[PDB]
Amino acid sequence: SGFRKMAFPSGKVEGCMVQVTCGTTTLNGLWLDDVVYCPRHVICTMLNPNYEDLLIRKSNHNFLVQAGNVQLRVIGHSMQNCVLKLKVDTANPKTPKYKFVRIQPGQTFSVLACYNGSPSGVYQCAMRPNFTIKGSFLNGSCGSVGFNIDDCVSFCYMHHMELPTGVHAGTDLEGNFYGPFVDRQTAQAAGTDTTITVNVLAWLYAAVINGDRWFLNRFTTTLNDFNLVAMKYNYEPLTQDHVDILGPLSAQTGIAVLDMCASLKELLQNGMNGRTILGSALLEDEFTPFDVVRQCS
Amino acid sequence: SGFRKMAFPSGKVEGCMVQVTCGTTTLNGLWLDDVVYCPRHVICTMLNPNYEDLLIRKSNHNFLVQAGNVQLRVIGHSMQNCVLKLKVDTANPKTPKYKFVRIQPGQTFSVLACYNGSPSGVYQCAMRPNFTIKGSFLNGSCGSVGFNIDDCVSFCYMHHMELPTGVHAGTDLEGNFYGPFVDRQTAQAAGTDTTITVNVLAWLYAAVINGDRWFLNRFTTTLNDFNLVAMKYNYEPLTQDHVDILGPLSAQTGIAVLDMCASLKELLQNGMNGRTILGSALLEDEFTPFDVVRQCS
């Protein structure tokens, strides 16, 4: 019993974190086999930088990579989109089985926050519909990575910058930003966000699995009638694919997806009336259906 | 910016988790140097067991310890309070610098949930005033450990059982239960719980550090007048030691502890009136002052 915002065990990623210094700028890098990945803005000093120019002016010896108390030698350097790739002379002996994946909004992942190549903590978050994440990051955290584990680590996020609202923007491990953001200091704000409906429904199923039933009712709704209410409350539309994804949870609890939608409609219209669900006073949308099944099963 | 329920990086503990099987019972063990620690109820089959008797009847060969895909040989076995200590023939080469600590209620720690010796996820929780924890644990999780890191891992919790309310009870790593619980199936319920006042105040300071100020006011209260309101709302008394502990956060924000207490009093008396703090609709009490400073600094 119980339901917690649970991260993946971080050991396999801890063994990959390094420090990358370029001049007076230090941030984190990800060391896999004989390559170190880090945000390319480590080469900046930049309202509007030309990274091609900045990199032409660098030599391998301008890059100091530290793995623990050991200096790695840079033997090559290239740029892929917004990531710098530093070839080093020694392969990381702790490289896990891994792949790089670009996630869809609404998907969750674990973040290993690091400073100076040293992991500080681990937490769970979601890619918001507006392609920001609500992380916890201070100066020096750039290059910290987000990931899921399946013995295979799927890296999906590298941290690059904090937006003015205090939310966070970054890239896949090929250097492509999530969202419309660019790695320079200019006026860029997150778009308006929405709530991840399928995740809220997943979390209500988690609550039932854990004995919270007070929000259930005998009514059902049509997908169309539900999505009409969703839009009024700034929730993402629910698709038939979402319904199918919730299938296993609907079967384990015996509550049809469209029956749970009638619960969610009631909750949106009347609030909780002073009650809580899994210890929360608001509707939680950063657990995926997969997250529920993993933790409740 | 941002504030998240953050766990310690789990790698140093992952390397210590093993599987302990005794007959048809399998649970998790903690392998440090040449000893494996696990809950002694692994030797049970038990409304009222006599563990001294059950252990006399065992031999080393009745204990199957598996570290990954390798069998460790048990060469000795003893019982300390409610923990079994299994001496094995090979020292764990991944043993971190570590110590065993018994924490006070209100302190937080990271849990590495494991099944069959294999880590499943990591989350943060607190020792509640009634000496239970609100964890996330399924059958087979017994022997999962709680810990803090300082390069030294301080183990503070080993999981033993789930209570009927869905909360969790266990021991320090010397086998002494937190709280009045015993490791057998009998009628034992958690005592009435209370809210950890100093932690709620810590979390309000975190909110100010992150730009939530709407709950602040110009008033101050006396420690005595505050504790009068605390008791009415089932909050732990605030002591001068708590006030002193909050010193650094009070200094960084320039808000006197007793000024923040007047905020907390208002919040207890009038609620949030539909507003949120650090993304929560209720007052959070599972961050210590130390947790705030670590994450905000």
Ligand SMILES: CC(C)(O)CCOc1cc(Cl)cc(-c2cc(-c3c[nH]c(=O)[nH]c3=O)cn(-c3cccnc3)c2=O)c1
């Ligand atoms: C355009 C916009 C988005 O509106 C305003 C911000 O614009 C940028 C653009 C770029 Cl290209 C980098 C950064 C940035 C740089 C650094 C950094 C600089 N120099 C170092 O030695 N080390 C660092 O870690 C840190 N953090 C940051 C701060 C807090 C949380 N997360 C990230 C940053 O956010 C910001």
Ligand SMILES: CC(C)(O)CCOc1cc(Cl)cc(-c2cc(-c3c[nH]c(=O)[nH]c3=O)cn(-c3cccnc3)c2=O)c1
């Ligand atoms: C007296 C009281 C507290 O009121 C009722 C419960 O009483 C006990 C007493 C003891 Cl001594 C053990 C357990 C228990 C045993 C096991 C277990 C048994 N056999 C195995 O092969 N493996 C196991 O993992 C598991 N979980 C458990 C379940 C869910 C979450 N956390 C723990 C358990 O809670 C419960």
